[PDB]
Amino acid sequence: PHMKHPLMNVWTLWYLENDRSKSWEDMQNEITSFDTVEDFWSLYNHIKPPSEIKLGSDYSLFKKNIRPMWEDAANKQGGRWVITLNKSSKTDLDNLWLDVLLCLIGEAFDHSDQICGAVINIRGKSNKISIWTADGNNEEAALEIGHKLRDALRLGRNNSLQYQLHKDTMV
Amino acid sequence: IINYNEGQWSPNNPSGKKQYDREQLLQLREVKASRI
Numbered sequence: 001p002h003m004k005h006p007l008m009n010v011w012t013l014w015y016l017e018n019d020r021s022k023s024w025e026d027m028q029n030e031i032t033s034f035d036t037v038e039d040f041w042s043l044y045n046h047i048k049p050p051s052e053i054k055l056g057s058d059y060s061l062f063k064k065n066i067r068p069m070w071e072d073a074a075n076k077q078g079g080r081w082v083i084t085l086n087k088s089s090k091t092d093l094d095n096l097w098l099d100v101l102l103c104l105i106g107e108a109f110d111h112s113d114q115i116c117g118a119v120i121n122i123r124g125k126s127n128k129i130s131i132w133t134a135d136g137n138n139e140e141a142a143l144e145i146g147h148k149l150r151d152a153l154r155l156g157r158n159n160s161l162q163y164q165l166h167k168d169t170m171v
Numbered sequence: 172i173i174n175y176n177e178g179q180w181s182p183n184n185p186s187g188k189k190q191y192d193r194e195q196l197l198q199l200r201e202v203k204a205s206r207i
């Protein structure tokens with residue numbers, strides 16, 4: 001019985017599957033929660049990577065008790081660093097999504113208390129990877145997360161990294 | 172199994188900060204796959 005390495009926070013994996021008949025809130029599915037590096041890999045090892053999940057699906061990793069919704073109290077005044085990706089390699093997509101997951105569970109950002117979670121959208125035309133932030137009105141924290149995001153993910157130039165307030169996105 | 176930083180969490184010195192690099196997080200997956 002070996003000791004596992006605990007994470008600073010408890011994270012929950014959500015999986016959304018599109019359905020014309022259902023409402024967006026009902027498309028979401030809570031999968032599981034974890035709080036160690038080993039239990040993260042155990043989960044990641046048995047789930048489909050983003051490059052294999054059905055068209056119109058989302059993966060979301062959010063801290064415990066924060067639903068991946070604007071309506072959630074943690075995200076009401078928040079925003080999201082959006083990364084839009086043109087039709088590219090599957091390997092590049094999965095690697096980019098994994099790197100985001102590792103930044104989150106590893107607490108790569110100085111303002112850890114500012115991080116809510118991350119969402120990847122599979123839409124065929126263009127895949128989007130977003131990192132949800134707690135306070136969109138604080139440009140300081142948003143930009144700090146932005147630079148760490150550009151560096152850590154090694155984001156290429158002329159790769160769209162844009163921030164949006166959730167209030168504006170509802171429009 | 173891996174190199175730990177001074178202020179980082181570990182079994183010994185368990186008061187450290189629960190923060191992990193990319194490479195460190197990658198070292199910790201490998202213990203299951205490699206073994207029989």
Ligand SMILES: CN1CN([C@@H]2O[C@H](COP(=O)(O)OP(=O)(O)OP(=O)(O)O)[C@@H](O)[C@H]2O)c2nc(N)[nH]c(=O)c21
Pocket residue numbers: 024025068069070071121123128
């Ligand atoms: C994050 N979302 C997304 N969403 C619903 O999903 C739609 C957004 O689709 P997405 O999930 O943003 O991917 P995309 O299809 O790329 O968005 P768009 O097509 O507007 O660019 C919105 O029109 C809205 O109806 C939401 N609806 C509610 N009530 N709460 C939420 O937090 C969210």
